[PDB]
């Protein structure tokens, strides 16, 4: 309900490449793997 990252550009959560702009579940996958890598780094 928070507009999860990768759910769509202008659809609550998203912004970026074509997959992130399209949203759905692949944008969720892109946001999940990216945030997991940068949380591991920090």
């Amino acid at each position: 309900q928070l507009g999860e990252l990768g759910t769509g550009a202008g659809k609550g959560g998203g912004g970026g490449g074509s997959v992130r702009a399209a949203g759905g579940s692949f944008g969720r996958r892109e946001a999940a793997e990216e945030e997991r890598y940068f949380r591991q780094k920090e």
Binding site: A9, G17, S18, R29, E34, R36
Partner: protein, 469 residues
């Protein structure tokens, strides 16, 4: 001469004259009317009948009611007596501070300055906003457009530009509230009073406000932008001052023209609009310019309907602006404020020979990283972050650091968020983004770049995070 009302259909009134007809764009006044309803002649229908648009509510009008021709277009008070005052579309004082006693009046319809009068001066106007100053820098005396949908931050950005520029400008400023909330007009009026830009006691007022809001009829909302522009034109021409013209929202000028165009007997254009959309916008916008007599720095908020930048009203407005900053909902949803799209906002003075080679190269370098970041996100979705090679690892990491660093707390948005407002010099913005592009801060976390003014606060926030954790 004297005329009589023939038809009343919506905000369009047809009146018939017996003597010579009033010209187009003349102001007509209904006689048996208490709040001084004013009709503006739009077209001659033939058989001694002209068709008008009403500047106020049309309720209670009677066929046969006497209408008086003023012999001129809508004339509003202009001059220093309008500073610190609020005017409606027809120049009446709506701030309840008595009449506007002045000697100068100007018609709200005028010709644009000629090609001989054009000025080609282009110097960078520093606003303190890092994304604005770096990627799409504003020019002094140029036209600035704040594109965006609903809720993306056009109003907050134009309030921040008023706070950063109009408070310590030097020279008069004009705000034109065109078809927006009356609450926002009340909020801005009291913010100007508290800031000292409006003095209710002295004559040291700097800003003149003209307001036609959402409750106004389409005739008033389609002419109030010309009323604020007339005040700005008087300050530019008859005084030679440097004028700041803030307009919010300029889309309502176009929208109010489309509401009455069906009742004026016009076939609709594409999407649905007046067929005279580009011409009506062109005549209005080309009056807002820097003459050789004086300069008008214009900042216009532009509503983008349903976030569709290919809508005919935002699309026609793009060609009229030196600098355009597009506010994106996707940028705003990530938490980045201001929500300026870095790959959709352009400036005319973004040149190596205008802002310097270092400023241009860093700005192009930032936009290249952010564009490669968008290209790489599809590979991240499919291949994953595990298989990207260290080059694309540094591209993604520096892009997220750049994207977070474009955000900035606003002083006018402190009550919204709680973060203290920060003003950033252009030199600190160039140095800060150069450090991220060079890779000097690859060891810092990306959270340290979020909502911080300078790059020294990025280091301090990272040290605070490391010490606390």
């Amino acid at each position: 001469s004297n005329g009589q009302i023939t038809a009343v259909i919506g905000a369009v009134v047809d009146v018939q004259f017996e003597d010579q007809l009033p010209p187009i764009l003349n102001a007509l006044e209904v006689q048996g009317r208490s709040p001084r309803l004013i009709l503006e002649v739009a077209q001659h229908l033939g058989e001694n009948t002209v068709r008008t648009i009403a500047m106020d509510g049309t309720e209670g009008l009677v066929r046969g009611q006497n209408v008086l021709d003023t012999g001129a277009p809508i004339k509003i008070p202009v001059g220093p007596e309008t500073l610190g005052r609020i005017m409606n579309v027809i120049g009446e004082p709506i701030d309840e501070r008595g009449p506007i006693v002045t000697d100068k009046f100007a018609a709200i319809h005028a010709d644009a300055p000629e090609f001989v009068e054009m000025s080609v001066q282009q110097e960078i106007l520093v606003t303190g906003i890092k994304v604005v100053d770096l990627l799409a820098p504003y020019a002094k005396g140029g036209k600035i457009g704040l594109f965006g949908g609903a809720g993306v931050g056009k109003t907050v950005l134009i309030m921040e530009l008023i706070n950063n520029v109009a408070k310590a400008h030097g020279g008069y400023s004009v705000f034109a509230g065109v078809g927006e909330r009356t609450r926002e007009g009340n909020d801005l009026y009291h913010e100007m009073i508290e800031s000292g830009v409006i003095s209710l006691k002295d004559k040291t007022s700097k800003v003149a406000l003209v307001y036609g809001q959402m409750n106004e009829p389409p005739g008033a909302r389609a002419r109030v932008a010309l009323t604020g522009l007339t005040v700005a034109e008087y300050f530019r021409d008859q005084e030679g001052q440097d004028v700041l013209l803030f307009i919010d929202n300029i889309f309502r000028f176009t929208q109010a023209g489309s509401e009455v165009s069906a009742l004026l007997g016009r076939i609709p254009s594409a999407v649905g609009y007046q067929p005279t959309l580009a011409t009506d916008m062109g005549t209005m916008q080309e009056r807002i310019t820097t003459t050789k007599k004086g300069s008008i720095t214009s900042v216009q908020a532009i509503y983008v309907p349903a976030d569709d930048l290919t809508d005919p009203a935002p699309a026609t407005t793009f060609a009229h602006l030196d600098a355009t900053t597009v506010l994106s909902r996707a940028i705003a949803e990530l938490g980045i404020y201001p929500a300026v799209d870095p790959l959709d906002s352009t400036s005319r003075i973004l040149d190596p020979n205008i802002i310097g080679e270092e400023h241009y190269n860093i700005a192009r370098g930032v936009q290249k990283i952010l564009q490669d970041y968008k290209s790489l996100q599809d590979i991240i979705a499919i291949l994953g972050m595990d298989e990207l090679s260290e080059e694309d690892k540094l591209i993604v990491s520096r892009a997220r650091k750049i994207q977070r660093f474009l955000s900035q707390p606003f002083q006018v948005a402190e009550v919204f968020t709680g973060h203290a407002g920060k003003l950033v010099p252009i030199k600190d913005t160039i140095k800060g983004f150069k450090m991220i592009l060079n890779g000097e801060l690859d060891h810092l976390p990306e959270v340290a770049f979020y909502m911080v003014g300078p790059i020294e606060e990025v280091v301090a926030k990272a040290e605070k995070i490391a010490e606390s954790q």
